[PDB]
Amino acid sequence: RVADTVGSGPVNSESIPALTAAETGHTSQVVPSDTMQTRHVKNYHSRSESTVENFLCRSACVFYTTYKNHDSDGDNFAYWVINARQVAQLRRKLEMFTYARFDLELTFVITSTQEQSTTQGQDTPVLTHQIMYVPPGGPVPTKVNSYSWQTSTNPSVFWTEGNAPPRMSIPFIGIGNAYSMFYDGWARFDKQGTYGISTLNSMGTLYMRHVNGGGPGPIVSTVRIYFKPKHVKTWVPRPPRLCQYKKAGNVNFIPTSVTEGRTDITTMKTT
Amino acid sequence: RVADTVGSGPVNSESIPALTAAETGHTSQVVPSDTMQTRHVKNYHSRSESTVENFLCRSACVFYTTYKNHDSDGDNFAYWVINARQVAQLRRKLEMFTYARFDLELTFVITSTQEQSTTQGQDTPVLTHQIMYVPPGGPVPTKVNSYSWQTSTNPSVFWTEGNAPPRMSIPFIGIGNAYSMFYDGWARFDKQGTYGISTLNSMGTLYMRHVNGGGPGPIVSTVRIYFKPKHVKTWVPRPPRLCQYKKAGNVNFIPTSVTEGRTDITTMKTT
Amino acid sequence: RVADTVGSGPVNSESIPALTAAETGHTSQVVPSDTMQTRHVKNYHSRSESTVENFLCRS
Amino acid sequence: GAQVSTQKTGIHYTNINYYKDAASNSANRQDFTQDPGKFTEPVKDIMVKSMPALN
Amino acid sequence: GAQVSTQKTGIHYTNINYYKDAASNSANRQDFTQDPGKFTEPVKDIMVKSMPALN
Amino acid sequence: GAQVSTQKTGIHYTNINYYKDAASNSANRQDFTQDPGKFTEPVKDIMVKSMPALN
Amino acid sequence: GYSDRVRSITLGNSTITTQECANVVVGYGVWPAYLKDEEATAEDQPTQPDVATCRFYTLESVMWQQGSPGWWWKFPDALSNMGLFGQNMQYHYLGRAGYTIHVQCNASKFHQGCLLVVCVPEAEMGCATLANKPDPKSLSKGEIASTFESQNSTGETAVQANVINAGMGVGVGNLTIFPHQWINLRTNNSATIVMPYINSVPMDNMFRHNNFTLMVIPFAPLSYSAGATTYVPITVTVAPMCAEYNGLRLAGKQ
Amino acid sequence: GLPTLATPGSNQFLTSDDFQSPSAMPQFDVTPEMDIPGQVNNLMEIAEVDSVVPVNNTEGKEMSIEAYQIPVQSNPTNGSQVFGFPLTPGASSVLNRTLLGEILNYYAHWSGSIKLTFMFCGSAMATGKFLLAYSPPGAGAPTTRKEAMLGTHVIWDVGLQSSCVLCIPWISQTHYRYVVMDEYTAGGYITCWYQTNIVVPADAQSDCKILCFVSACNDFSVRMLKDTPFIKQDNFFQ
Amino acid sequence: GLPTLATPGSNQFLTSDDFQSPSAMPQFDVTPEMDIPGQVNNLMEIAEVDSVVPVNNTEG
Amino acid sequence: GLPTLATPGSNQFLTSDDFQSPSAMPQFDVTPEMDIPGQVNNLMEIAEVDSVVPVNNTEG
Numbered sequence A, B: 001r002v003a004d005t006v007g008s009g010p011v012n013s014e015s016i017p018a019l020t021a022a023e024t025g026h027t028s029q030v031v032p033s034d035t036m037q038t039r040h041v042k043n044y045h046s047r048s049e050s051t052v053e054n055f056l057c058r059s060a061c062v063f064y065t066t067y068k069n070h071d072s073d074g075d076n077f078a079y080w081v082i083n084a085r086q087v088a089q090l091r092r093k094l095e096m097f098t099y100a101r102f103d104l105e106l107t108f109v110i111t112s113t114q115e116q117s118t119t120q121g122q123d124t125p126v127l128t129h130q131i132m133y134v135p136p137g138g139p140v141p142t143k144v145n146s147y148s149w150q151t152s153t154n155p156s157v158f159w160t161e162g163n164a165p166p167r168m169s170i171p172f173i174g175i176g177n178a179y180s181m182f183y184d185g186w187a188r189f190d191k192q193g194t195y196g197i198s199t200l201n202s203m204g205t206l207y208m209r210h211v212n213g214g215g216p217g218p219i220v221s222t223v224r225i226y227f228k229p230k231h232v233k234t235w236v237p238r239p240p241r242l243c244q245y246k247k248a249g250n251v252n253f254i255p256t257s258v259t260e261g262r263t264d265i266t267t268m269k270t271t
Numbered sequence C: 001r002v003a004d005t006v007g008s009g010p011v012n013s014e015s016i017p018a019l020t021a022a023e024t025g026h027t028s029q030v031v032p033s034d035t036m037q038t039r040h041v042k043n044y045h046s047r048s049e050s051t052v053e054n055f056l057c058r059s
Numbered sequence D, E, F: 001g002a003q004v005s006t007q008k009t010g011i012h013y014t015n016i017n018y019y020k021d022a023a024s025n026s027a028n029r030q031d032f033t034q035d036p037g038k039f040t041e042p043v044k045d046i047m048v049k050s051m052p053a054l055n
Numbered sequence G: 001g002y003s004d005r006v007r008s009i010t011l012g013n014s015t016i017t018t019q020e021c022a023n024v025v026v027g028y029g030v031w032p033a034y035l036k037d038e039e040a041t042a043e044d045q046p047t048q049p050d051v052a053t054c055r056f057y058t059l060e061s062v063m064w065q066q067g068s069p070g071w072w073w074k075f076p077d078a079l080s081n082m083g084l085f086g087q088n089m090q091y092h093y094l095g096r097a098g099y100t101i102h103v104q105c106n107a108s109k110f111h112q113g114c115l116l117v118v119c120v121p122e123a124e125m126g127c128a129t130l131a132n133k134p135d136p137k138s139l140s141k142g143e144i145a146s147t148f149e150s151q152n153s154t155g156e157t158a159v160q161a162n163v164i165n166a167g168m169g170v171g172v173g174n175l176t177i178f179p180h181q182w183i184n185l186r187t188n189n190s191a192t193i194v195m196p197y198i199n200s201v202p203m204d205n206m207f208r209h210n211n212f213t214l215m216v217i218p219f220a221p222l223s224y225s226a227g228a229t230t231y232v233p234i235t236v237t238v239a240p241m242c243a244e245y246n247g248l249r250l251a252g253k254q
Numbered sequence H: 001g002l003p004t005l006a007t008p009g010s011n012q013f014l015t016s017d018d019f020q021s022p023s024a025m026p027q028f029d030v031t032p033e034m035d036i037p038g039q040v041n042n043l044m045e046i047a048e049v050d051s052v053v054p055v056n057n058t059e060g061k062e063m064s065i066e067a068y069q070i071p072v073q074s075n076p077t078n079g080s081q082v083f084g085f086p087l088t089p090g091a092s093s094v095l096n097r098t099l100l101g102e103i104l105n106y107y108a109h110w111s112g113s114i115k116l117t118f119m120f121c122g123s124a125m126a127t128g129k130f131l132l133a134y135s136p137p138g139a140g141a142p143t144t145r146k147e148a149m150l151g152t153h154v155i156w157d158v159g160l161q162s163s164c165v166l167c168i169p170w171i172s173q174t175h176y177r178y179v180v181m182d183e184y185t186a187g188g189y190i191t192c193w194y195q196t197n198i199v200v201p202a203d204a205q206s207d208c209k210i211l212c213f214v215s216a217c218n219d220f221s222v223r224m225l226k227d228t229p230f231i232k233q234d235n236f237f238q
Numbered sequence I, J: 001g002l003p004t005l006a007t008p009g010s011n012q013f014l015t016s017d018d019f020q021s022p023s024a025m026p027q028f029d030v031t032p033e034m035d036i037p038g039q040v041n042n043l044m045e046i047a048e049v050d051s052v053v054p055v056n057n058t059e060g
């Protein structure tokens, strides 16, 4: 909840509530009660919706891929290296804090589309997919059927099209006491090579694939990944991203104006 | 939970914490507090995820089969002799212990695919399957319709495609006080014949089949079996499997190197 | 639950646990403790699965 | 108004009946009665094992 | 063994956690902590509004 | 007749068993026993770290 | 007046002395003992020979050489020919027992080498030929030690004896999870283990099942300068502990 | 009917779920539990056990038992190096295949101290002093007995106690380290050098062998389950 | 609506299940129980009974 | 089976929902929390901070 207004009458003193020294770096705790007369107002407004928890706690697409039901050579499955910088929306949000800590709520929205052919007599059964997570170091799949899909240890989800979207929870899997949103450092101790957040980045890959081919007719399924931070903790606020994003592995940008211009320094007709 | 570090200062004694006699077979209870100075560190790390229970408790595919909706002569159903050695993943895990005891959580993932033809006017209804377990000694099915599918006693599962995968629980059905992962013995008292785990192996077969043919168009369904030990007990640890597996009914292997080589006994650039 | 085994030593008597008259129609309540020496065995086996209820209760 | 019974082991489980007709309830498997004396020893005359069936 | 918390109004709601890993729980939104003194007034020297920042 | 156990943290969760066969229950992961003395120090003779393994 | 090297073990008419030892490894911390009425299934009264059977039997010796890859002895059987043990073993269907294994080997202060003495329970072995199963004679030869090889074994029905895998498809250097001691000529003289009965059943047949295998593999090859004694033997001595037997009948093995 | 609202994740199959499920075999009477020796409760009790490290996995020796034999001999110079490998227990050709290595390869995160034990297997008439040392990552890798000695070390004299226990303490910027080789999570370097050449009398072997065992300390732990990269498969076995 | 998450095994038919189910015949008044002789409680009471063994099941 | 009546909104995916869900990683031991300086609890603590205003955002 917000602070309510205090009743104010006229004043005559050597007290200077109106003047400070911004050079201090301290922000003024000046209310309207100073510098003007005010009535009394019991303010009930709540800041409940601007809590860090609520600002972040909302599913957001972070990526998506494709894969066919058919293809000789295996080669008809997809993968994606987990990371939250390939999407503009959420990245900018998470990047309003230097360090953060939170659990994640994974939600997948799987859909299938059928493409044009010549194939006839098609009466396709339900489609069942498989999303498999592979922690870093684990054996990665090669073809739509390499042994590794047994997931004897790697966790994964099986899902039949037509049902409620799949969903899981992930604990704070960070190595350090928190996730790093930025990293003004290098990977190797001789500053040679990778520079940027891209070095802290290392959370395994996600593998998708059709379990059953369905029919002989060509089909293309798409998997959408949705993150949703929970039980959040945030440290060190930062200036929101001004320039548009240019790369997923770094801060790179092309210089941008601070805002838009108007005619005079006096124009109320804002841009 | 793990043990925390003890504060250590400099020493001067006839005490030899740094030297023992490995020939003893006893492993050293040497901490870093000995052989070096250390600060005090309250360690909170938990071993929770390395518990035998958690190491095993994760569904893993152990096998799978096929069967057509059609075929004259019956002959369009499948079967599989329960056993956990036809898959590399899980076997190696279970084989990290000589004897184990546990309940099993069965989960089946059934899918159907349609093959090419000439058939027309196909508007295929939902597919319903039947997985039937047959304890050893029980009457086994011959054709897609032999009386034995009544399962008056044998338990089985009926499932309609499109729904959540089927699942059951099995108690520790062992004869002895535990499951044997290895058996350096024979079947007959005259060492003639079968040698190996293959002799303790005897847990019945699993029968699958389409209940309804669906349409006249050719269809091929595949059943995937998933085990998942629960309430686990393990005895006598063993060296993980080094050589690749070669047979499902025995330990047979072809000699393998202990590890990979490097250039010198001094090369830090590991392989 | 099943009955456990009783410890048995050697015997010398006019008692005939080994011989009856089946013509009676009565079934013998002869355990292995009679007609042979036995150790003691606390038997935990349960007949739970052979109950009439369980024998029939299956679709 | 539920009821707790012990499970089948080598811990209990709660349970409530939701239907009005007792026929709707699940099979009572926690049952364990037994009388073999019906089928064996159905003789009007009690027999001592140590003794002979003719004397 | 549940728990009752008040709802967001201008009445409560019961709740039980069904999972073993706390990560499975829902976001805690009934939270309301706040310290602006970190970001504003981060001066080692306390400033009186009535007074000047130089004297 | 339920039971409350603590969750895995850095709060509890209620739970009831609905089935009669204990095999139906979920994996007990709240377990935490441990004896390394089986595998290390399996010597009939207790060894003092400060001392030598031969004297 | 002592040394944690000194050592005197006695069972029956046999006695062992240790002028150089480490300690005594004891199974998995479990010391052998007679089967309780609570863990039993066989209802007949068991036989407990005691002194007549629980004593020290000393197998045939073997010569260690600069090339010797290793040796092994299956166990339930190996004593199949030792006095009244082997006998009670032939007349009974069931039996269970613990053991006190004592491997002895001695060199001079000028010799050097190092042996690994382990007790692998349930040491199932693979065949040299993928398609077959190794014949009995290749698996165990009673009191006669079997040998590992410094290379791949060959065809028919032999065991894949290449040492690096202990014929079990594992990394030979990891056998250390099982009960073991090292005989490091430089500081050792003998190794002693106390294996308790280990199996997934209270009792078992003794000719059909080998509940464990002793292996003696040299990791540090034997060596010595010219003039030094050249013949360095290794001798295994084992003693049954708390042997029970059940199901008496005629004797043999099917 | 009690009003119900199904939430996402329904009818889903999660490998690592954990719910109750109906028993296919009711009132089954399980066989009573026995008391088999050597029961394991946690995979760590395993990794706290010593296993031989194939340190000399050099030039074809990985195919022989020599892979475990560290070569040592009488030298005409001081400070010569004996061996060296990086503290990368998870993905290092040397370590990764040990008892500790094997276990590690079933996870993705690790933290803790390590015990390296060395056993001198030369004639009882042979002598010598060695310098076992661990140098944290940061600078290069030690290439002199000096440099190496500026790190954490122990000087092992070979007397009657033929087994010396060096103890690599946990020292990292982060709590855990990846099981895979990531330079962010570098682990440092382990080296061994002659402190005082191997001295031998006449008629006694100059060259000897040292064995090395690796194992984890009581502060070691692991996280994040994953399949081992060590076991593959092409078709179902038979 | 009370939030629900269905688990695998749903809409499944397990021969040996054991759940409650709606009665097709409500408030039916069953015929009172009588006391027939020789009631069996377990299949073992059967097997504890003697039966003749065809030991000479030889040549026809 | 306890009688159930599903209500509208079932099997629906609402971006801003808030239900419990199964953990893909059981008994995971999270890394202990540290005490980083300058923690934020609400986006307002941000907006109460001063920033320079580009008032003369005029002609280029």
Ligand SMILES: CCCCCCCCCCCCC/C=C/[C@@H](O)C(CO)NC(=O)CCCCCCC
Pocket: A082, A083, A084, A085, A094, A104, A106, A131, A132, A133, A155, A156, A157, A168, A170, A173, A174, A175, A178, A179, A180, A181, A182, A197, A200, A201, A202, A203, J024
């Ligand atoms: C079937 C179930 C499948 C479950 C799959 C779960 C996959 C993991 C998803 C984790 C998403 C974490 C998002 C946190 C943001 C951090 O990426 C950032 C953001 O700039 N940088 C950083 O990378 C921070 C550096 C921290 C390093 C952590 C190492 C693990």
Ligand SMILES: CCCCCCCCCCCCC/C=C/[C@@H](O)C(CO)NC(=O)CCCCCCC
Pocket: B082, B083, B084, B085, B094, B104, B106, B131, B132, B133, B155, B156, B157, B168, B170, B173, B174, B175, B178, B179, B180, B181, B182, B197, B200, B201, B202, B203, H024
């Ligand atoms: C509709 C419901 C259908 C339910 C079907 C249930 C089928 C049974 C699945 C049992 C899986 C057991 C797995 C345990 C591993 C043992 O196989 C091993 C492993 O090497 N050896 C051994 O074989 C050990 C020897 C023990 C012998 C036990 C005899 C029963």
